[PDB]
Amino acid sequence: FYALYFEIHHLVASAALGFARVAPIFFFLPFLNSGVLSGAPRNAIIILVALGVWPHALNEAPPFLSVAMIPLVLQEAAVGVMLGCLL
Amino acid sequence: LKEPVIVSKMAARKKITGNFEFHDPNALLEKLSLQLGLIWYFDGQAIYIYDASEMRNAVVSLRNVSLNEFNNFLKRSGLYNKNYPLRGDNRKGTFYVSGPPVYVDMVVNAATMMDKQNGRQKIGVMRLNNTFVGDRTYNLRDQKMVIP
């Protein structure tokens, strides 16, 4: 019964990279910024939106494992402000 | 068909359209389960329908009954299926069953519920003919000799 714990544990690993793509769209949009949204339910919404759009299956192991982690966030944030500035 | 039909959840996303007619549906159910790809089972009260990718397998061991003892129970009750027979040696405890998910989990659950529910002496009388019986003692007054 060890893999059942790993399924919720692969999800929470998968949501961190999912947060880094779509968070600076939640700063740019006029009906979604910090001027219109509070602090307590902000971080609840931004997590579960990325859980519904993640392309790979959640129970599987992510291909993130120790490749290059500090430059990967600046990759996904830089493409994120592109989706913000086009939208 | 005079029984209620149970279609699974994954086998209801496929679609079919056309003009159909029913006059012997037990032969129609066999043909459409092979052209479209499906598995079905009728247990005397209802018809369960799964798609083909839900067939599951199992292997179980019986410590104190045979397969031929269990197959008369399956034939007599009415759950014996000649499309998914039992593959195994005729007098052993191990076999291999595979089929629809409502058919497989019943046979295994009944097999592990018959072992948990579950030598004769005999007398022979021999009259001797060439020797006395019982141990004797011989008081030959030099030494107490015994012959068992």
């Binding site: 019964f1 919720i8 929470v12 961190a16 971080n43 129970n59 | 199992a58 179980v60 061991s61 405890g93």
Partner: protein, 88 residues
């Protein structure tokens, strides 16, 4: 004896919740029927006078302590892992 199903094929699920709910329902009926069958093992007097039966029942008490505590802290670490993400 015992039973094993051979093919643990990944039955793909529409969301992860039904898998968790079947795991929760797969083990709640498990530990509930264990809690009778060791208590009734204690509650039957003929079961407890035999020394041979006693170390078997001694064994399942140590299993029952070890089972639920291995499931308890695993979810306790799981709630503690997910809240540190969701808090932010």
């Amino acid at each position: 004896g015992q039973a094993v199903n051979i093919r643990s094929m990944e039955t793909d699920i529409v969301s992860l919740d039904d898998r968790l709910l079947q795991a929760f329902s797969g083990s709640a009926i498990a530990t509930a029927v264990d809690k009778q069958t060791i208590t009734n093992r204690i509650e039957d007097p003929n079961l407890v006078t035999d020394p041979k039966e006693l170390a078997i029942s001694q064994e399942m008490i140590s299993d029952y302590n070890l089972y639920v505590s291995m499931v308890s802290t695993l979810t306790r670490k799981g709630v503690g892992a997910v809240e540190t993400l969701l808090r932010s």
